[PDB]
Swiss-Prot record, chain A:
This is Proteasome subunit alpha type-3. SUPFAM superfamilies: N-terminal nucleophile aminohydrolases (Ntn hydrolases) (SSF56235). The 26S proteasome consists of a 20S proteasome core and two 19S regulatory subunits. The 20S proteasome core is composed of 28 subunits that are arranged in four stacked rings, resulting in a barrel-shaped structure. The two end rings are each formed by seven alpha subunits, and the two central rings are each formed by seven beta subunits. The catalytic chamber with the active sites is on the inside of the barrel. The lineage of its organism: Eukaryota, Viridiplantae, Streptophyta, Embryophyta, Tracheophyta. It comes from Spinacia oleracea. Gene3D superfamilies: Glutamine Phosphoribosylpyrophosphate, subunit 1, domain 1. GO terms for biological process: proteasome-mediated ubiquitin-dependent protein catabolic process. It is found in: Cytoplasm; Nucleus.
Length: 239, 249, 229, 196, 231, 238, 230, 240
């Protein structure tokens, strides 16, 4: 009724509607899952093929941020790239000034502060993307998730996009303390395949990146062989 | 953010700027003041708008200000902005006397102030100064001068003019009664007469008035001076006696 | 960052509406008043707090800007702090340049210009406050008032905030020249008592006074109670 | 290097100056007129680096003309001198001009005047002035024969004598001098002193 | 609908309408095609003059020896983006004395485009670039919508009446990956023919530019494409 | 007009956006309270995780602005973190520029002055967070302060924030009418009890967080869950 | 409404650009025809009153020794574009000592067209309500281009802008023969400009210019000769 | 800085703010200029003589240079800024080039300045329409120009601006002839009289000779007004 038109305007209910519209943009995007296994972190993203001519590997959605951490973005991908670039900038700047690799916790805090700042200005559009960090610090694996409003918390499992609720419910049914990242691959592949609904959307390509001990704590894509076998297992798990 | 912009500097379909016209209205709601360009001097008289009895009145002036040794002004409109404008005007006069080492001729001071006002009138999107000035001073160029400034940033020289509340009645009586060769005393008397006849209340009170005159001392020194309350009382009594001294027939 | 569009334009009637809203906003603030005795000045205000749990001693409404000068505000509290800080800064600039205390009138004029700035500059609202600046200096006692429009006046006595009219009439009828400083203090306390719902106590109101040639001091509750007793 | 000097008679202020423009050893020109007219009633002899002399003199003339048309009343001589001094003093610490200026003028209500303005921007209303190596001879001879009421004949005789001495005793003696006079009628050229 | 006048105003449905208007700007362009094999990229564009006497508007362009661009949308913005891409390729060559990979240029271009969709005083670009060049991996084809997003396809088409070419490619894109230069050229020609509304294809309507792992960028001449069409 | 949308005076002199910020604070369900004692200052709030997934150690509203200063932020979490970063930058800058620890009242005044800025500059929404500052002034003894989105910092002997302002205040001033001098244990247990009497439910010492200062130990500290549990038992048995 | 200067319309077209394109419809008709010999330009002066000095109303301005320019729409906004083109062509001469090609000047003028906006990123706040013909000769031979406020241009064999656009273009397509000798080319442009013009074609009412090797604005006596030939 | 597109295109291609500037011009004092063979007269409607104005220190027809003069119509407040910049340019041209500005040059400079304002962001167009006059140096051939709020300019044999500009323009269109000496002043006075029938006490007239500008005296304007007022009645009686 005139109040839902700016980011510097509280609606009489004491809430900012522009932030909620941004968050809705994420809700419309596509699932992004992160899991904190015993020996690392596994990120997985349901990536939707818009047209069959796309090249398998197009518009990758799981990005590195620095040597020991990486992101998965859901929501408006163009904003996800801006946030990933900022996370890279923060990582390298801290590395430079203090001569130490950024504690993933500090990296997430800086990223979240940036996302929040991008709302305080009347002349900026708030980011319409939510991200998941999974760095493997000297304090161990630790998974964060930053919301388009600027809030962030450390999770043991996470999810965003269309598949929020199914993904969360399925994660809770898993004993994260007991599964190695190799088991996390299978679990996340199975979850992503369950949460997808071919009856509604077109096909999709699972894109998963492990920040584990095999990956030498360095964020990397899941090896092709393990990924394909996990895809086959996840498909078999639907019956 | 665009929707919150009033666009102060913009032409209306009539070809006239609204905010400046509203500024002239604001002047119209302010206390009255008039100027008389006499042969031997220039006289400014003003009406103190706020006249609560608890006001101190010990402060020398509320509407007339000295801008330099040779120029003074009487303010109408928003005195808050008038303070800034007089501060600027004094600064401009001193800037001329520094660069050239001599008094800044009145017309130039008026024009510089008006160029300050026109800036707000034309660009930047800020509200114009809602003020209007009467300037009294003396030059080697032209001797005694009286000028009037609109908040439009426009000005003109006047043998006798008025600003503020009830402007036009005083203007008309000045048209009817002002004459060349009006001397010091005659100018003072005429100003008092026209004002009181323009006032809602006769037998005015010195506490509700201000009279200043920029004349020339015998030794060629422009002497500005604002009358003390007792001098106002003397003039008020003399005028309230001389008005019936003419109206008797 | 354009933010260069006066949000306080001229209404078709010539009135500056937003300044009028600011004047109302002070009109709904707690009352304050000031009187100038023939040999000193006095300012006081009501300091009634929403709860007992609020430590009344942790904040003062009467604040002195220079040892000669003190101010009282009515309307929004946060704005008065801005204005006090800026006025202190200007007083210290004056003292740096000339090694003398700033005259009351000059401090008032500079604070008034600060007030005015926000009524023309874009992207900001005028201060929801009016100030009573009490000072005593080389040319006698002085009490000045400043309002969100940036205009200032010299009063013999004045008030503002909640209950303006009753306090104003009370002062007008009860004020007189040659009033001593103590008479002025009693008169101010009585004026506060007039409209002060509840009962006055040293922990409910705040008083500041400047003696002859001396420093502006804010009365402590231990002695205001002696005055009102 | 330039020589310039002035002289205030009863109703006139003469200014003379050498008219030789040089580079190092070559008199590229001997007709270089250096005494400017600021107004119908002003002269401004200048001495200093030729580029700075010309640029500063033109700048000051621009400002004088701007004042004239905008107000309708021309700058009085004293105000023109003070404005020159102000501009020169402000440039002094930022991008100094190396020009020495002698300003003469006539104003109906004040009479002839002659101002001394140094490249350091020191201004003084002098009775007689001179700049450059010819300054010594010019000043001594003027002092010897100067009076406060000289007829233009006497003033021009004095300037001729000063020119002859400056030629005779300087090593950089320039051969050609120009003489310009300001009176009630206005700034003007009096005579050209061809030597060659 | 009031969530529509400024870029920085999200719509309550999670949509950004000014950006969608920009993305619609592309649809008024002419059919810009592009189809990729593992070694080659072929950008073909349909040329529509604004009159019998007046000539058409150029739409294919060279960015450096190994990158080309086919723009759709308003040309005033295609020119600025092409100049920017050329400048970046030149700067990278200057610093590292090597060719800038396609992917990184494309991502910088998408960042440049997105930056405009986030600030109040700026507007989206309204030109959809279909970048095709070379990397160490071989050939690559991208598409940059004014929204700031970018995609990678074995083949694609944009612009008015680009659905017919898109629908031909979707039949034949399975073959491009292993296709030779000539077969890609043939597929580009046919995919254009599918765009022409019953007109016999001729060299005078479309220009074909090809880049290859061994060939620099080049726009095929008017006569050779005509001769090829005569088959 | 626009005055409902931006911080300019309403026709009756109210700034509606600031009020809406206050409503935002009272939103979010959380409520918190602080009790200043003779020897300590205790500040307590409730935190609740809805998921097994969310790590409980990553969610908290107690912030160590300085080893000797704390701050309990009530309101929107992102704004609470922004204000917290700003205050941490100020505390370090004050200690650097002036050579001694920043006093509690100075922190409260600075936060309030910063908040006032949003309330005057039209295009800056006031932070939706009420921040309670606790610390033991080196000379004034224990301190407690409360800054609001408007900018009215005032010092409170005891105070509440969040959805249950009034209930907490009423209970606290009922229990404090006598102007008591609370011991440490008594202070912290009064705070916990006033929270109980507002929630109308018990709590397992896990959905609650407490932060305390002591003259014998000025460091702003967060109580162990076992200490919270011992305080709960002590409340139970009297 | 307070739509921004840079606001896209729902069909993808900038509003202000469309409103500017409308502004050329009100401008004087200006017509040019390319040929092997050179290029010809013409434009109705629109001399409102006899007092106005005809010669002082210039609508064909030289950009450089080989690049004419016919202006239509807001002739105030056209001056600026031609001054920019003049400085650009001279810079190119300075920086290479050779004439700037015509297509590059056109592209130089057009690259200025869309710079408008708000926010201190560009001083211009509004599009140029001017569409130009650029008639030049360079290494490619005679060439004729034209532009519009959409910051776009394209080479053409004959074009007519301003109010008469549609009629002049129809008559041009019906008659532009591609064998035209310069003599025929200029009579065709003048005959078209005659019918479009409400006032009778007089030496003073029209402005003709031949690019050929070097730009030449026809003097009134020269115009009378071709009006007679017509 | 404040950037806002005050001047913008209306859905039918018009610049509304420029046209409103033109209307602001319509409301200004009438002005007339009549280029003759040897002189260029200017005139304006009001000489500031409403029985109390002290008009000693300001003339409406203003010198930009001893070479050049200017008459302005429309807002008086903007005229001062435009005239100051024109004077500054007249001097800066002499500095940059020894030659004084030719009339067309300064006219073009003013025109471009006005256009810049109609297109620069965050600034109001000048509401002016100037008449400019002068003798191009070394030519002794008079020159008459005008600019209009749009920023477009052109020369004229004669012209008028301000209120009733049209009526004066028709008078000139029917009554103009190649005048000289006093005849040019006669035509200018008649042209102004068409609209300001209260002749004499209202007109302010100046004439440009090759040697500069000089403004007629009250007695002189009155003499011309009386001459026309007698000869027109005589001609009307003779014809009728």
């Amino acid at each position: 009724t005139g109040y839902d038109l700016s980011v510097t305007t509280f609606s009489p209910d004491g809430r900012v509607f522009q932030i909620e519209y941004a968050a809705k943009a994420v809700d419309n995007s596509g699932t992004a899952v992160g899991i904190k296994c015993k020996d690392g972190i596994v990120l997985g993203v349901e990536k939707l093929i818009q047209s069959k001519m796309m090249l398998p590997g197009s518009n990758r959605r799981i990005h590195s941020v620095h040597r020991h951490s990486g992101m998965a973005v859901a929501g408006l991908a163009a904003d996800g790239r801006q946030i990933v670039a900022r996370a890279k900038s923060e990582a390298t700047n801290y590395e430079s000034v203090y001569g130490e690799a950024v504690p993933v916790k500090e990296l997430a805090d800086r990223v979240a502060s940036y996302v929040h700042l991008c709302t305080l200005y009347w002349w900026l559009r708030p980011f319409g993307c939510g991200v998941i960090l999974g760095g493997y610090d000297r304090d161990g694996p630790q998974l964060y998730m930053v919301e388009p409003s600027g809030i962030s918390y450390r999770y043991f499992g996470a999810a965003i996009g269309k598949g929020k609720q199914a993904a969360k419910t399925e994660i809770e049914k898993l004993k994260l303390s007991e599964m190695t990242c190799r088991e996390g691959i299978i679990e996340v592949a199975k979850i992503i395949y369950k949460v997808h609904d071919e009856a509604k959307d077109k096909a999709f390509e699972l894109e998963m990146s492990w920040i584990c001990d095999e990956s030498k704590r360095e964020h990397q894509k899941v090896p092709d062989n393990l990924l394909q076998e996990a895809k086959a297992a996840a498909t078999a798990a639907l019956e | 953010s665009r929707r919150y912009d009033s666009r102060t500097t913009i032409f209306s379909p009539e070809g006239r700027l609204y905010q400046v016209e509203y500024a002239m209205e604001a002047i119209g709601n302010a206390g009255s003041a008039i100027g008389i360009l006499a042969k031997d001097g220039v006289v400014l008289i003003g009406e103190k708008k706020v006249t609560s009895k608890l006001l101190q009145t010990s402060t020398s002036t509320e509407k007339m200000y000295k801008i330099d040794d040779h120029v003074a002004c009487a303010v109408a409109g928003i005195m808050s902005d008038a303070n800034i404008l007089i501060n600027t005007a004094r600064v401009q006069a001193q800037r001329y006397t520094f660069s050239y080492q001599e008094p800044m001729p009145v017309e130039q001071l008026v024009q510089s102030l008006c160029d300050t006002k026109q800036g707000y009138t034309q660009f930047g999107g800020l509200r114009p100064f809602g003020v209007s000035f009467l300037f009294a001073g003396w030059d080697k160029n032209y001797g005694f001068q009286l000028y009037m400034s609109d908040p439009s940033g426009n000005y003109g020289g006047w043998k006798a003019t008025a600003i503020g509340a009830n402007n036009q009645a005083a203007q008309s009586m000045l048209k009817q009664d002002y004459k060349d060769d009006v001397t010091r005393e005659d100018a003072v008397k005429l100003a008092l007469k026209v004002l009181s006849k323009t006032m809602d209340s006769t037998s005015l009170t010195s506490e509700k008035l201000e009279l200043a005159e920029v004349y020339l001392l015998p030794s060629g020194k422009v002497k500005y001076q604002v009358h003390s309350p007792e001098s106002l009382n003397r003039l008020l009594t003399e005028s309230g006696l001389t008005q019936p001294a003419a109206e008797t027939s | 960052s354009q933010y260069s569009f006066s949000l306080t334009t001229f209404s078709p009637s010539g009135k500056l509406v937003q300044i009028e809203h600011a004047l109302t906003a002070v009109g709904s603030g707690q009352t304050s008043l000031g009187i100038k005795a023939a040999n000193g000045v006095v300012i006081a205000t009501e300091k009634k707090l929403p709860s007992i749990l609020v430590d009344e001693a942790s904040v003062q409404k009467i604040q002195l800007l220079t040892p000669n000068i003190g101010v009282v505000y009515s309307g929004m509290g946060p704005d008065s702090r801005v204005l006090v800080r800026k006025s202190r800064k200007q007083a210290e600039q004056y003292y740096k340049l000339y090694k003398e205390p700033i005259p009351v009138t000059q401090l008032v004029r500079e604070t008034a210009a600060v007030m005015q700035e926000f009524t023309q500059s874009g992207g900001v609202r005028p201060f929801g406050v009016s100030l009573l600046i009490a000072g005593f200096d080389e040319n006698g006692p002085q009490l000045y008032q400043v309002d969100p429009s940036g205009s200032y006046f010299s009063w013999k006595a004045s008030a503002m905030g909640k209950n303006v009219s009753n306090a104003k009439t009370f002062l007008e009828k009860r004020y007189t020249d040659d009033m001593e400083l103590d008479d002025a203090v009693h008169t101010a306390i009585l004026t506060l008592k007039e409209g002060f719902e509840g009962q006055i106590s040293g922990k409910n109101i705040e008083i500041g006074i400047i003696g002859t040639d001396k420093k502006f001091r804010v009365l402590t509750p231990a002695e205001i109670d002696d005055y009102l007793g | 290097m330039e020589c310039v000097f002035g002289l205030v008679g009863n109703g006139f202020a003469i200014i003379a100056a050498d008219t030789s423009a040089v580079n190092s050893i070559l008199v590229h020109k001997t007709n270089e007129d250096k005494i400017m007219k600021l107004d119908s009633h002003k002269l401004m002899g200048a001495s200093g680096e030729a580029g700075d002399r010309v640029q500063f003199t033109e700048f000051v003339q621009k400002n004088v003309s701007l004042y004239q048309f905008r107000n309708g009343i021309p700058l009085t001589t004293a105000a023109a001198a003070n404005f020159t001094r102000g501009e020169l003093a402000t440039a002094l610490r930022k991008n100094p001009y190396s020009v020495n200026i002698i300003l003469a003028g006539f104003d109906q209500d004040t009479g002839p005047s002659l101002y001394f303005i140094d490249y350091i921007a020191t201004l003084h209303k002098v009775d007689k002035a001179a700049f450059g190596y010819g300054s010594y001879f010019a000043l001594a001879m003027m002092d010897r024969h100067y009076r406060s009421d000289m007829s233009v004949d006497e003033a021009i005789k004095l300037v001729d004598e000063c020119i002859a001495e400056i030629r005779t005793r300087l090593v950089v003696a320039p051969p050609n001098f120009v003489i310009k006079i300001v009176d009630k009628d206005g700034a003007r050229e009096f005579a050209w002193r061809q030597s060659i | 609908n009031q969530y529509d006048t400024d870029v920085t105003t999200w719509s309550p449905a999670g949509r950004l309408f000014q950006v969608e208007y920009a993305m619609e700007a592309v649809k008024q362009g002419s059919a810009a095609i592009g189809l990729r094999s593992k070694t080659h990229v072929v950008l073909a564009c349909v040329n529509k003059a604004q009159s019998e006497l007046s000539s058409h508007q150029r739409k294919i362009f060279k960015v450096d020896d190994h990158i080309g661009v086919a723009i759709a949308g308003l040309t005033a913005d295609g020119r600025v983006l092409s100049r920017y891409m050329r400048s970046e390729c030149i700067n990278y060559g200057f610093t590292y004395e090597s060719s800038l990979p396609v992917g990184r240029l494309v991502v910088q271009l998408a960042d440049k485009a997105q930056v405009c969709t986030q600030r109040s005083w700026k507007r989206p670009y309204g030109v959809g670039l279909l970048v095709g060049g070379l990397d160490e991996s071989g050939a690559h084809l991208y598409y940059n919508c004014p929204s700031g997003n970018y995609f990678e396809y074995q083949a694609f088409a944009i612009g008015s009446r680009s659905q017919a070419a898109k629908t031909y490619l979707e039949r034949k894109f399975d073959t491009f990956d292993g296709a030779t230069r000539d077969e890609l050229i043939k597929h580009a020609l046919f995919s254009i023919k599918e765009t022409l509304q019953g007109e016999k294809l001729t060299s005078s309507v479309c220009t074909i530019s090809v880049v290859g792992v061994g060939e620099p960028f080049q726009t095929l001449d008017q006569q050779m494409v005509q001769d090829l069409i005569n088959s | 007009g626009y005055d409902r949308h931006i911080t300019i005076f309403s026709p009756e002199g109210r700034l509606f956006q600031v009020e809406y910020a206050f409503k935002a604070v009272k939103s979010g369900g959380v409520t918190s309270i602080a009790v200043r004692g003779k020897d300590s200052v205790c500040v307590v709030t409730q935190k609740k995780v809805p998921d097994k997934l969310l790590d409980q150690t990553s969610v908290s509203h107690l912030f160590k602005i300085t080893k000797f200063l704390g701050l309990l932020a009530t309101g929107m979490t992102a704004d609470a973190r922004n204000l917290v970063q700003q205050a941490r930058n100020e505390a370090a800058e004050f200690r650097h520029k002036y050579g001694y620890e920043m006093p509690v009242d100075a922190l409260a005044r600075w936060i309030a002055d910063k908040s006032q800025v949003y309330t005057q500059h039209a295009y800056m929404r006031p932070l939706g967070v009420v921040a309670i500052v606790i610390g033991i002034d080196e000379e004034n003894g224990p301190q407690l302060f409360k800054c609001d989105p408007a900018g009215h910092f005032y010092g409170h002997k005891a105070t509440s924030a969040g959805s249950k302002d009034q209930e907490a205040i009423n209970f606290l001033e009922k229990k404090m009418k006598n102007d008591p001098a609370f011991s440490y244990e008594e202070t912290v247990q009064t705070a916990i009890s006033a929270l109980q009497s507002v929630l109308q439910e018990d709590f397992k010492a896990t959905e609650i967080e407490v932060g305390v200062v002591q003259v014998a130990n000025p460091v702003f500290r967060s109580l162990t869950t076992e200490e919270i549990d011992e305080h709960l038992t002590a409340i139970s048995e009297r | 409404y307070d739509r921004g200067v840079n606001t896209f319309s729902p069909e993808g077209r900038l509003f202000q650009v469309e409103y500017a394109i409308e502004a050329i419809k009100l401008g004087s008709t200006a017509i040019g025809i390319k040929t092997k010999e050179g290029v010809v330009l013409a434009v109705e002066k629109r001399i409102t009153s006899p007092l106005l000095e005809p010669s002082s109303v210039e609508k064909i301005m030289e950009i450089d020794d080989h690049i004419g320019c016919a202006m239509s729409g807001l002739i105030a906004d056209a001056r600026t574009l031609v001054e920019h083109a003049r400085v650009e062509t001279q810079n190119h001469r300075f920086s290479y000592g050779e004439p700037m090609t015509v297509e590059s000047t056109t592209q130089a003028l057009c690259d200025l067209a869309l710079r408008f906006g708000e926010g201190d990123e560009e001083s211009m706040s509004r599009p140029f309500g001017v569409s130009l013909l650029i008639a030049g000769h360079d290494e490619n031979g005679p060439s004729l281009y034209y532009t519009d406020p959409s910051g776009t241009f394209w080479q053409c064999s004959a074009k007519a802008i301003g109010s008469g656009s549609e009629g002049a273009d129809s008559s041009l397509q019906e008659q532009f023969r591609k064998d035209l000798s310069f003599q025929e080319a200029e009579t065709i442009a003048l005959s078209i400009l005659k019918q479009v013009m409400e006032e009778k074609l007089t030496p003073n009412n029209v402005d003709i210019a031949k690019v050929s090797p070097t730009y030449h604005l026809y003097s009134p006596s020269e115009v009378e000769a071709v009006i007679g030939r017509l | 800085r404040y950037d806002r597109a005050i001047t913008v295109f209306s859905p039918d291609g018009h610049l509304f703010q420029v046209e409103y500037a033109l209307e602001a011009v319509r409301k200004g004092n009438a002005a007339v200029g009549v280029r003759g063979t040897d002189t260029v007269v200017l005139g304006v409607e009001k000489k500031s003589a409403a029985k109390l104005q002290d008009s000693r220190s300001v003339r409406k027809i203003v010198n930009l240079d001893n070479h050049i003069a200017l008459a302005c119509a429309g807002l008086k407040a903007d005229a001062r800024v435009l005239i100051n910049k024109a004077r500054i340019e007249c001097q800066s041209h002499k500095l940059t080039l020894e030659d004084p500005v030719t009339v067309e040059y300064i006219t073009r400079y003013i025109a471009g300045l006005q256009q810049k304002y109609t297109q620069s962001g965050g600034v109001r167009p000048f509401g002016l329409s100037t008449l400019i006059v002068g003798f191009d140096p070394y030519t002794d051939v008079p020159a008459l120009y005008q600019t209009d709020p749009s920023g477009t300019f052109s020369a004229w044999k004669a012209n008028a601006t301000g209120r009733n500009s049209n009526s004066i323009r028709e008078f000139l269109e029917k009554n103009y002839k190649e005048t000289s000496g006093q005849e040019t002043v006669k035509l200018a006075i008649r042209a102004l009289l068409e609209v300001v029938e209260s002749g004499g006490k209202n007109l302010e007239v100046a004439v440009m000779r090759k040697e500069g500008l000089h403004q007629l005296e009250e007695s002189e304007i009155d003499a011309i007004v009386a001459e026309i007022e007698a000869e027109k009645a005589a001609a009307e009686a003779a014809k009728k």
